[PDB]
Design a protein around this ligand. Structure first.
Ligand SMILES: NS(=O)(=O)c1cc(C(=O)O)c(NCc2ccco2)cc1Cl
Ligand SMILES: NS(=O)(=O)c1cc(C(=O)O)c(NCc2ccco2)cc1Cl
Ligand SMILES: NS(=O)(=O)c1cc(C(=O)O)c(NCc2ccco2)cc1Cl
Ligand SMILES: [Zn+2]
Ligand SMILES: [Zn+2]
Ligand SMILES: [Zn+2]
Ligand SMILES: [Zn+2]
Ligand SMILES: [Zn+2]
Ligand SMILES: [Zn+2]
Lengths: 116, 116, 116
């Protein structure tokens, strides 16, 4: 899984253990090994929602599978509660997009996943 | 809609009202509510186009629908004109990718849009 | 092609010719014109892989075709080698996602590529 979390909260408000904790959360919920999860964090960024600059996170989650309709309900509930607990965001200021990828469209260790 | 606008123009050159005006523009062009529109702006960034560092914008627009072939002609005309007016970019310096999402792949308010 | 290279390596460590040389690399690999290749470089960013902050690059490659299964093996080999050479990254610290776009989802010069 490859996750990007962007927020307009400052970098000092996104704790240093955020990526590690999010890596544990997605490992368990997506059944993926920790060494196949990458997390990008972009804090202090300009972001609006409804043109408001109130605190918000916009997250992208890519994975090869593990993204059925029902799995995404569960990942959304978990990531949303996690951002509430760690970033203090309201439950309605966490916007997530999922991308279910084929292994032909992922490169790792110098070739595609499909070709590994 | 979840929109990301990246530019090599300095942050001081993307006016504070950019997100507001672009929110209004996309609400009208996509027939989407203002409170379902998020805009990320990333200025001051390293970007090249044909390896040139001349001013350019690279924009991603995600939406659940409202992205037909015909719709996308209208969004591109409107966004490209808006970047020309506000950022002074040439008409051939605004690069846009559209992602038409299913509602099972968007998380908002703690569950998927499909499950809401 | 529209390529995003994010890395936790500092900006001073990503050479000023990085984008020139990647633009040549992608033009030859994908058989796409140099003036249809944009690259975004986001260095100095928070990234973990397996929760490690060791040096890593997370890259997204979007293209109107040229991303067959076999094509993606070649692009992964070349881009991974290229990051080993220029950024001093290990082979297993280069994570790539490919997105194969329809021309109705790409806006350039004020209209879609499909409608050019
Ligand atoms: N190991 S796997 O086939 O389940 C696998 C699964 C995935 C996946 O994203 O599901 C993947 N994504 C790219 C990546 C992220 C971090 C390191 O490589 C790579 C691999 Cl090898
Ligand atoms: N209201 S809606 O069902 O048309 C809707 C539609 C969309 C959409 O993107 O089309 C959407 N994207 C996620 C989001 C962006 C900003 C706040 O939530 C969310 C919702 Cl709830
Ligand atoms: N020339 S083309 O039809 O093969 C073409 C191909 C692509 C493509 O991405 O394959 C494309 N992407 C948008 C873009 C990137 C840089 C400048 O415009 C645009 C065009 Cl016009
Ligand atoms: Zn920091
Ligand atoms: Zn599942
Ligand atoms: Zn600013
Ligand atoms: Zn307004
Ligand atoms: Zn620099
Ligand atoms: Zn060259």
């Amino acid at each position: 899984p490859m996750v990007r979390v962007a927020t307009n909260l400052p970098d000092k408000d996104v704790p240093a253990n955020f990526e590690e904790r999010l890596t544990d959360l997605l490992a368990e919920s997506m059944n993926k090994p920790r060494n196949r999860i990458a997390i990008e964090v972009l804090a202090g960024q300009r972001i609006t929602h409804g043109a408001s600059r109130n605190p918000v996170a916009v997250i992208k989650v890519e994975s090869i599978g593990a993204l059925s309709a029902d799995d995404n309900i569960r990942h959304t509930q978990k990531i949303t509660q996690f951002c509430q607990d760690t970033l203090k965001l309201p439950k309605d200021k966490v916007i997530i997009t999922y991308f279910d990828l084929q292994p032909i469209h992922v490169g790792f260790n110098g070739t595609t996943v499909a070709a590994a």
